[PDB]
Amino acid sequence: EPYKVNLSQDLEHQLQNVIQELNLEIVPPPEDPFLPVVLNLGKLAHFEPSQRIGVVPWSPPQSNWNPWTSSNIDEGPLAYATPEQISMDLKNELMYQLEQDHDLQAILQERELLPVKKFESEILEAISQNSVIIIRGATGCGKTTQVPQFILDDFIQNDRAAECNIVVTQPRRISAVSVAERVAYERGEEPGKSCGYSVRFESVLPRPHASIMFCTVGVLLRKLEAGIRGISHVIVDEIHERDINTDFLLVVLRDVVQAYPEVRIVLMSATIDTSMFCEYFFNCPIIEVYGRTYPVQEYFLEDCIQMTHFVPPDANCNLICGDEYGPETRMSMAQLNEKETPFELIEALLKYIETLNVPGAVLVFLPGWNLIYTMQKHLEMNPHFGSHRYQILPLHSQIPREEQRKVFDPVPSGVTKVILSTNIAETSITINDVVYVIDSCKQKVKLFTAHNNMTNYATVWASKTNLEQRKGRAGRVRPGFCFHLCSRARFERLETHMTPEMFRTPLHEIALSIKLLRLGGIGQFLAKAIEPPPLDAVIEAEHTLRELDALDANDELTPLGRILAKLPIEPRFGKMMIMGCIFYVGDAVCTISAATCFPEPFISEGKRLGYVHRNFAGNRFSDHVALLSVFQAWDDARMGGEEAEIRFCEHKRLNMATLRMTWEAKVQLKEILINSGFPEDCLLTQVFTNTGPDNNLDVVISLLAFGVYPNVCYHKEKRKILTTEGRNALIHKSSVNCPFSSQDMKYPSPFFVFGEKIRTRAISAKGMTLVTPLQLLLFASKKVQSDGQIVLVDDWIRLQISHEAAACITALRAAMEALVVEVTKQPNIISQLDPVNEHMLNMIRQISRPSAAGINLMID
Numbered sequence: 037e038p039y040k041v042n043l044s045q046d047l048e049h050q051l052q053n054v055i056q057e058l059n060l061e062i063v064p065p066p067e068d069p070f071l072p073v074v075l076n077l078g079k080l081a082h083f084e085p086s087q088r089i090g091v092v093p094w095s096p097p098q099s100n101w102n103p104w105t106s107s108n109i110d111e112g113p114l115a116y117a118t119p120e121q122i123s124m125d126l127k128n129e130l131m132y133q134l135e136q137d138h139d140l141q142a143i144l145q146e147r148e149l150l151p152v153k154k155f156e157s158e159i160l161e162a163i164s165q166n167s168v169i170i171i172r173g174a175t176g177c178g179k180t181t182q183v184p185q186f187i188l189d190d191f192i193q194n195d196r197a198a199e200c201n202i203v204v205t206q207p208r209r210i211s212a213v214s215v216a217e218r219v220a221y222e223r224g225e226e227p228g229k230s231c232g233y234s235v236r237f238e239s240v241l242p243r244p245h246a247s248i249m250f251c252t253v254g255v256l257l258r259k260l261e262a263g264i265r266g267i268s269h270v271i272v273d274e275i276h277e278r279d280i281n282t283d284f285l286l287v288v289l290r291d292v293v294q295a296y297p298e299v300r301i302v303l304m305s306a307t308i309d310t311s312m313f314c315e316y317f318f319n320c321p322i323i324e325v326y327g328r329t330y331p332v333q334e335y336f337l338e339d340c341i342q343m344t345h346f347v348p349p350d351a352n353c354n355l356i357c358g359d360e361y362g363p364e365t366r367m368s369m370a371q372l373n374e375k376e377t378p379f380e381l382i383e384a385l386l387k388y389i390e391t392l393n394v395p396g397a398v399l400v401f402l403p404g405w406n407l408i409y410t411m412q413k414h415l416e417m418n419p420h421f422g423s424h425r426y427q428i429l430p431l432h433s434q435i436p437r438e439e440q441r442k443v444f445d446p447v448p449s450g451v452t453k454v455i456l457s458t459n460i461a462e463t464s465i466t467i468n469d470v471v472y473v474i475d476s477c478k479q480k481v482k483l484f485t486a487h488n489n490m491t492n493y494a495t496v497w498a499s500k501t502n503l504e505q506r507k508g509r510a511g512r513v514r515p516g517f518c519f520h521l522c523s524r525a526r527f528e529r530l531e532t533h534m535t536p537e538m539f540r541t542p543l544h545e546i547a548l549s550i551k552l553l554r555l556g557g558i559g560q561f562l563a564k565a566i567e568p569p570p571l572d573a574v575i576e577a578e579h580t581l582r583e584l585d586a587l588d589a590n591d592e593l594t595p596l597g598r599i600l601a602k603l604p605i606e607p608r609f610g611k612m613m614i615m616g617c618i619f620y621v622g623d624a625v626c627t628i629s630a631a632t633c634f635p636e637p638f639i640s641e642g643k644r645l646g647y648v649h650r651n652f653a654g655n656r657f658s659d660h661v662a663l664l665s666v667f668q669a670w671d672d673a674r675m676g677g678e679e680a681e682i683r684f685c686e687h688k689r690l691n692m693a694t695l696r697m698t699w700e701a702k703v704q705l706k707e708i709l710i711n712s713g714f715p716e717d718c719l720l721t722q723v724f725t726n727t728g729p730d731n732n733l734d735v736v737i738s739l740l741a742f743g744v745y746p747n748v749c750y751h752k753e754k755r756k757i758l759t760t761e762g763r764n765a766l767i768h769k770s771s772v773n774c775p776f777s778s779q780d781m782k783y784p785s786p787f788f789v790f791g792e793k794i795r796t797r798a799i800s801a802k803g804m805t806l807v808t809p810l811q812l813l814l815f816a817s818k819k820v821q822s823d824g825q826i827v828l829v830d831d832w833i834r835l836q837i838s839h840e841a842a843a844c845i846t847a848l849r850a851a852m853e854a855l856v857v858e859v860t861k862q863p864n865i866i867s868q869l870d871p872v873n874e875h876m877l878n879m880i881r882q883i884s885r886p887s888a889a890g891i892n893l894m895i896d
């Protein structure tokens with residue numbers, strides 16, 4: 037039914053007077069109430085379109101240049117020091133370290149036994165003679181940790197240390213950091229000397245000479261605006277993962293290596309068909325790397341049920357079982373849901389592994405942290421799996437690096453190490469005690485569908501290549517056992533390979549990177565990829581960027597697009613942050629934005645929020661206000677020094693690591709807006725109240741509606757909400773807006789904007805913030821139609837509201853867009869806006885108020 041909006045007569049008129057002063061078109065009302073007219077003003081201001089394939093330039097290392105900071109070395113000995121001097125000094129330093137440090141000699145002795153060591157000479161010849169090589173070999177040979185070292189030490193030992201600066205790309209944040217720490221440790225160092233790392237919002241720079249930067253590809257791409265300056269070698273690691281940014285970088289690097297053949301590219305791959313990569317890079321050589329494998333006995337779901345005598349409480353391949361297996365096996369398998377992972381069978385399998393009386397670690401492949409937590413809980417219930425007999429360790433990207441390194445530690449005699457792992461343990465790391473693999477046969481992939489703005493953290497079937505790779509992890513120390521939890525018939529219906537990310541990932545961020553780097557057309561450049569993305573993804577990226585006014589009608593980068601290109605967040609949040617700067621609430625909007633890059637700081641364990649966490653929300657029915665209020669309290673507690681911070685965080689059940697990384701990310705976002713010319717004064721920390729009148733916070737909530745659009749919903753009763761699609765959905769358990777018990781919430785408005793629309797067995801809105809009907813019209817709606825008493829918003833909900841208010845508010849939206857265009861041309865103008873534009877912003881400030889829509893959040 038149409039929702040009744042109670043806005044005052046004075047507000048009606050003030051809106052009309054601002055639209056008067058903007059000399060703007062109040063789209064008049066229809067004659068026939070069944071001829072509904074579109075209120076949506078077209079664009080009221082544009083960027084002067086520009087005229088319409090570039091190569092990223094390359095230059096080699098040189099002694100007076102810091103390639104990591106992209107700046108001349110002017111202070112210190114290294115400003116004038118000769119390459120010969122630098123090389124002699126680094127060589128002398130290294131030989132002396134090696135002859136003095138006994139713990140270091142011992143570590144080198146371990147290095148010299150890695151399978152890859154035998155191929156050191158062959159690898160180094162191939163690189164010295166070819167612009168591009170591929171190093172191919174089984175996971176655990178030592179490609180990742182040793183090859184960057186082999187190259188550096190080659191230069192150091194041959195008196196040319198100064199001529200060597202290596203970029204190593206990794207498809208994951210966790211790999212870039214872990215490998216940097218591991219390689220530093222192998223060289224008797226911490227990151228910051230010969231090794232360093234750069235990931236989104238965190239870096240430890242290496243020394244400028246004879247050094248290795250481990251990064252994520254996203255970092256190297258954002259740093260390319262000035263070219264690859266002072267680097268001898270780009271090692272692209274784990275190319276077989278088909279991480280989308282790695283696929284993208286291979287396009288860039290192939291044009292680099294064609295134009296600048298003195299550069300060295302080294303691609304490194306697990307044992308897959310690398311023909312594609314070889315052919316792509318002008319039939320470059322492939323260096324085979326190998327060492328001792330062992331046979332691994334493979335079993336499937338039928339073999340597992342039979343040999344454990346286990347009994348449980350697309351077509352279904354658990355009803356298919358051959359006649360060489362007994363009837364209780366078939367009857368038991370046929371009771372298992374293929375969409376579930378049988379946690380109880382995994383327990384039974386661990387117990388069967390005991391009876392073999394061959395000691396070794398068990399690696400369990402589980403798709404996400406949810407099934408690792410679920411497995412871990414289930415085990416730590418049964419006292420059989422206590423400290424006396426078992427060390428059960430989780431391995432996922434989000435647990436702290438102290439805990440992640442424990443998977444490599446050895447375990448007391450008579451205790452069995454069990455690793456409950458994501459696919460990090462498939463090809464990117466090697467745990468050395470492993471004799472037994474239990475394989476869920478599933479992957480976790482983020483699927484996004486634009487048409488309905490639906491996110492699905494999907495549990496999908498692994499590939500045969502994934503099952504073969506997972507089986508290989510059992511056969512590094514002795515003959516091993518791999519227990520696949522899929523039926524033999526399910527295995528026959530598995531794809532050979534996962535879909536590459538390039539085929540199933542939104543491309544608007546890569547599109548911005550192509551345009552910032554002057555590489556040509558989005559379509560044109562992506563057509564040269566090794567396996568190009570689907571057309572509809574390209575069209576969808578171009579549509580997103582034009583709608584944001586990041587591209588002009590000639591598909592060229594606007595001054596707005598150039599700032600969004602530089603901000604390492606979702607473009608829509610980038611634009612939200614520019615709007616925050618204009619309203620002088622930049623700090624708060626940079627915090628909302630930074631927080632989307634990290635897990636929730638609330639340690640809530642998948643249950644409904646308790647009293648302490650709900651309290652951070654005040655009277656705003658907003659997960660985002662809760663998050664801003666946590667940061668304000670945390671930042672106050674931190675005045676008391678580290679231990680006061682630790683105590684505040686564990687007394688409030690907060691993840692301190694997440695609050696610190698989010699804070700660092702906010703500081704970096706603010707720096708980029710500063711260097712784009714936004715004044716310091718629009719980005720200051722602003723104390724606020726989450727209970728009393730606060731116009732700064734009202735504007736932040738208006739801008740959050742813009743940021744998360746089109747995620748709007750309407751509350752019916754209890755946890756039931758109506759989505760943009762006219763569809764029924766649930767309030768996420770996580771939300772301060774989820775009813776703790778049977779007490780139903782009394783929302784002063786039924787409208788919510790939210791961070792994520794999530795598909796599981798149902799549709800969920802996670803990260804929910806109540807907005808007024810005025811904020812809906814202003815920033816949480818594209819198309820609005822009026823019959824003259826009733827408005828239809830994006831074809832999914834109706835408001836009973838003045839035709840004049842609705843059209844006046846839609847015009848404010850259009851007026852606000854035009855100012856954003858003008859502000860991005862010259863950001864310092866926000867200091868000194870002409871009066872009509874201040875009145876426009878004051879009107880948005882006013883209709884952001886709860887009072888503006890007849891709401892008082894202090895009276896329930």
Ligand SMILES: Nc1ncnc2c1ncn2[C@@H]1O[C@H](COP(=O)(O)OP(=O)(O)O)[C@@H](O)[C@H]1O
Pocket residue numbers: 150174175176177178179180181182218441444463464465466467468
């Ligand atoms: N943090 C660590 N602790 C212990 N061993 C490690 C660690 N990191 C790597 N290794 C060991 O180094 C060896 C080489 O690993 P890596 O270079 O990743 O191989 P590849 O890249 O060829 O798969 C393996 O035996 C692995 O177990």
Ligand SMILES: CS(=O)(=O)Nc1cc(Br)cc(NC(=O)c2cc(-c3ccccc3)cs2)c1
Pocket residue numbers: 103104105106203234239249250251255256259260263264265266267
């Ligand atoms: C473009 S290139 O390939 O020639 N070099 C290159 C390659 C890669 Br991967 C990363 C980086 N730099 C960084 O990641 C960072 C630099 C800083 C910084 C700190 C203080 C002052 C100035 C810069 C912080 S992170 C550089």
Ligand SMILES: [Cl-]
Pocket residue numbers: 151174175176177327328512
């Ligand atoms: Cl191996």
Ligand SMILES: [Cl-]
Pocket residue numbers: 533536
């Ligand atoms: Cl493929």
Ligand SMILES: [Mg+2]
Pocket residue numbers: 179180181273274463464
């Ligand atoms: Mg590797």
